[PDB]
Short mmCIF file of C-alpha atoms in Angstrom, two decimals:
data_model
loop_
_atom_site.label_atom_id
_atom_site.label_comp_id
_atom_site.label_asym_id
_atom_site.label_seq_id
_atom_site.Cartn_x
_atom_site.Cartn_y
_atom_site.Cartn_z
CA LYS C 1 149.17 159.48 159.66
CA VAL C 2 145.65 160.06 157.80
CA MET C 3 143.56 162.99 159.23
CA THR C 4 140.10 163.97 158.36
CA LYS C 5 137.65 166.32 160.16
CA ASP C 6 136.96 163.44 162.60
CA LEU C 7 139.66 160.82 162.13
CA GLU C 8 143.44 160.36 162.99
CA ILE C 9 144.57 156.98 161.46
CA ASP C 10 147.94 155.37 161.85
CA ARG C 11 148.36 153.04 158.73
CA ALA C 12 151.31 151.23 160.36
CA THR C 13 149.30 150.13 163.67
CA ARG C 14 145.53 149.68 162.68
CA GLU C 15 144.99 152.61 165.24
CA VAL C 16 142.06 154.84 164.76
CA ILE C 17 141.10 157.91 166.84
CA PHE C 18 137.56 159.32 166.21
CA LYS C 19 136.56 162.62 167.82
CA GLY C 20 139.31 161.89 170.28
CA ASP C 21 138.19 158.39 171.28
CA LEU C 22 140.27 155.57 170.70
CA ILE C 23 138.07 153.05 168.64
CA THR C 24 138.61 149.25 168.24
CA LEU C 25 137.80 148.20 164.53
CA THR C 26 138.18 144.63 163.03
CA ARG C 27 140.86 144.41 160.37
CA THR C 28 138.38 144.68 157.51
CA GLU C 29 136.30 147.62 159.17
CA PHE C 30 139.81 149.42 159.41
CA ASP C 31 140.75 148.70 155.73
CA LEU C 32 137.45 150.11 154.58
CA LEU C 33 137.61 153.03 156.90
CA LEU C 34 141.17 153.85 155.81
CA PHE C 35 140.51 153.35 152.08
CA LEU C 36 137.55 155.82 152.30
CA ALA C 37 139.49 158.39 154.55
CA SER C 38 142.40 158.20 152.16
CA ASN C 39 140.13 159.30 149.17
CA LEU C 40 138.18 162.03 150.45
CA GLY C 41 135.40 163.37 148.27
CA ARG C 42 135.27 160.37 145.81
CA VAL C 43 132.72 157.84 145.29
CA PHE C 44 133.41 154.31 145.08
CA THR C 45 131.05 151.68 143.85
CA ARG C 46 130.20 148.71 145.99
CA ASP C 47 132.08 146.31 143.75
CA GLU C 48 135.03 148.67 143.86
CA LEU C 49 135.00 148.66 147.63
CA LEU C 50 134.72 145.00 147.84
CA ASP C 51 137.91 144.85 145.62
CA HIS C 52 140.11 147.32 147.32
CA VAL C 53 139.16 146.24 150.95
CA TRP C 54 138.76 142.53 150.70
CA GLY C 55 141.50 142.16 148.03
CA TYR C 56 141.58 140.85 144.39
CA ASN C 57 141.18 137.26 143.49
CA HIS C 58 140.23 135.64 146.93
CA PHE C 59 136.68 134.67 145.93
CA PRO C 60 134.21 135.31 143.04
CA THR C 61 133.03 138.71 142.21
CA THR C 62 130.80 140.31 139.68
CA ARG C 63 133.73 140.41 137.33
CA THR C 64 134.16 136.69 137.62
CA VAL C 65 130.64 136.37 136.10
CA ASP C 66 131.61 138.64 133.17
CA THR C 67 134.92 136.74 132.73
CA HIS C 68 133.02 133.34 132.67
CA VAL C 69 130.33 134.56 130.21
CA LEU C 70 133.25 135.50 127.81
CA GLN C 71 135.04 132.24 128.19
CA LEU C 72 131.66 130.33 127.22
CA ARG C 73 131.57 132.34 124.11
CA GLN C 74 134.85 131.55 123.03
CA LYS C 75 134.41 127.91 123.69
CA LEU C 76 130.76 127.86 122.12
CA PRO C 77 130.92 129.93 118.95
CA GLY C 78 127.74 131.85 118.52
CA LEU C 79 126.26 130.86 122.06
CA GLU C 80 123.06 132.86 122.29
CA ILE C 81 123.60 134.66 125.46
CA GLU C 82 122.45 138.47 125.39
CA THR C 83 124.26 141.12 127.19
CA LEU C 84 122.00 143.75 128.88
CA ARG C 85 124.59 146.48 129.35
CA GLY C 86 124.59 147.59 132.95
CA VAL C 87 122.51 144.67 134.25
CA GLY C 88 123.48 141.14 133.13
CA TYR C 89 122.78 138.30 130.99
CA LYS C 90 119.95 136.37 129.30
CA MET C 91 120.18 133.20 127.35
CA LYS C 92 117.66 133.52 124.44
CA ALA C 93 117.42 129.94 122.97
CA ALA P 1 116.26 113.20 132.40
CA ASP P 2 119.84 113.92 132.61
CA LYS P 3 119.76 116.32 129.59
CA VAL P 4 118.89 119.89 128.91
CA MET P 5 118.69 120.65 125.22
CA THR P 6 118.82 124.08 123.45
CA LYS P 7 119.69 125.41 120.06
CA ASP P 8 122.84 123.72 119.02
CA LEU P 9 123.69 122.64 122.59
CA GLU P 10 123.27 119.36 124.64
CA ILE P 11 124.20 119.23 128.23
CA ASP P 12 124.26 116.03 130.38
CA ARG P 13 124.07 117.09 134.01
CA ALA P 14 125.02 113.60 135.34
CA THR P 15 128.12 112.91 133.12
CA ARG P 16 128.70 116.72 133.04
CA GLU P 17 129.21 116.77 129.18
CA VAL P 18 128.49 119.50 126.75
CA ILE P 19 128.11 118.82 122.94
CA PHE P 20 127.72 122.17 121.09
CA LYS P 21 127.41 122.06 117.24
CA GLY P 22 128.48 118.45 117.36
CA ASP P 23 131.60 118.81 119.21
CA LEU P 24 132.40 117.78 122.91
CA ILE P 25 133.56 120.93 124.53
CA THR P 26 135.69 120.82 127.58
CA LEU P 27 134.60 123.38 130.27
CA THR P 28 135.60 124.12 133.86
CA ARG P 29 133.36 123.02 136.74
CA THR P 30 132.20 126.68 137.07
CA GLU P 31 131.92 127.29 133.24
CA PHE P 32 129.66 124.12 133.26
CA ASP P 33 127.66 125.36 136.17
CA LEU P 34 126.95 128.61 134.69
CA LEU P 35 125.98 127.36 131.24
CA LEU P 36 123.68 124.88 132.59
CA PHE P 37 122.09 127.34 134.83
CA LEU P 38 121.38 129.67 131.97
CA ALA P 39 120.45 126.85 129.43
CA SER P 40 117.92 125.76 132.13
CA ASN P 41 116.29 129.29 132.54
CA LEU P 42 115.83 130.46 128.73
CA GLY P 43 114.58 133.91 128.11
CA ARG P 44 115.05 135.05 131.74
CA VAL P 45 117.58 138.15 132.48
CA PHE P 46 119.68 137.73 135.39
CA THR P 47 122.04 140.32 137.09
CA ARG P 48 125.61 139.44 137.86
CA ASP P 49 124.82 139.36 141.61
CA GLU P 50 122.05 136.90 140.96
CA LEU P 51 124.28 134.64 138.92
CA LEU P 52 126.97 134.81 141.52
CA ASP P 53 124.51 133.51 144.06
CA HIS P 54 122.83 131.10 141.73
CA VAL P 55 125.84 129.42 140.31
CA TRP P 56 128.77 129.96 142.74
CA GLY P 57 126.52 129.64 145.77
CA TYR P 58 124.80 131.85 148.27
CA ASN P 59 126.35 133.31 151.17
CA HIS P 60 129.66 131.44 150.65
CA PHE P 61 132.02 134.37 150.39
CA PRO P 62 132.03 138.25 150.86
CA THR P 63 129.82 140.36 148.50
CA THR P 64 128.64 143.75 147.83
CA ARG P 65 126.11 143.13 150.74
CA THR P 66 129.22 142.58 152.98
CA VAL P 67 130.22 146.10 152.13
CA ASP P 68 126.98 147.53 153.06
CA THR P 69 126.99 145.87 156.42
CA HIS P 70 130.59 146.99 157.03
CA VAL P 71 129.64 150.51 156.36
CA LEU P 72 126.86 150.34 158.84
CA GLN P 73 129.14 148.83 161.45
CA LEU P 74 131.51 151.84 160.85
CA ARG P 75 128.74 154.14 161.41
CA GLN P 76 127.70 152.42 164.75
CA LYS P 77 131.21 152.21 165.99
CA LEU P 78 132.06 155.87 165.02
CA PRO P 79 128.90 157.76 165.80
CA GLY P 80 128.32 160.67 163.48
CA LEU P 81 130.95 159.34 160.87
CA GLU P 82 130.47 161.22 157.47
CA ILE P 83 130.12 158.46 155.16
CA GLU P 84 127.48 159.20 152.43
CA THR P 85 125.40 156.34 151.10
CA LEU P 86 124.90 156.69 147.42
CA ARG P 87 121.94 154.36 147.08
CA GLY P 88 122.40 151.45 144.67
CA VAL P 89 126.02 152.84 143.72
CA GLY P 90 128.48 153.04 146.39
CA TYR P 91 129.86 155.23 149.34
CA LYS P 92 131.89 158.49 149.73
CA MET P 93 133.46 159.97 152.73
CA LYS P 94 133.01 163.80 152.57
CA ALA P 95 135.73 165.12 154.63
#
């Protein structure tokens, strides 16, 4: 079982006890709760939590945007898309 | 009317053809959609979240906003749950 101050979680059954009460969570709520509770004290980005809880490669993410920009660059050599590190992209001309 | 023209680049939105430096370029549908969007919005910076919505479609699939709302749902169902919101970054469970 996974234990925190307030939680007793059974990975096998989707069962959650919170401060003694049995709480009904959806499957995705459970996955998010278990992931955080299994990694106490650690900060996860919103992008990372989407990946870890909803899974990889089921739908487009911000990573997909980056990959598509790189593919455009390879197919159109010299394409004037500028990278703003930590933000996004701008086509110059 | 069908065309968007930028440096070295001709895009026809009706035939979905791209001519770059004199060569026809074979693109996937989403590569084309991204290129056409950027080429139609020269000089403008977009974040990755914005390009996701503008090019892949808004509210079509889970995003970081869905993460935010799920954290709120957990805090409602588990009153007092010790999830810390790191604004603009992510989340942490303290203990």
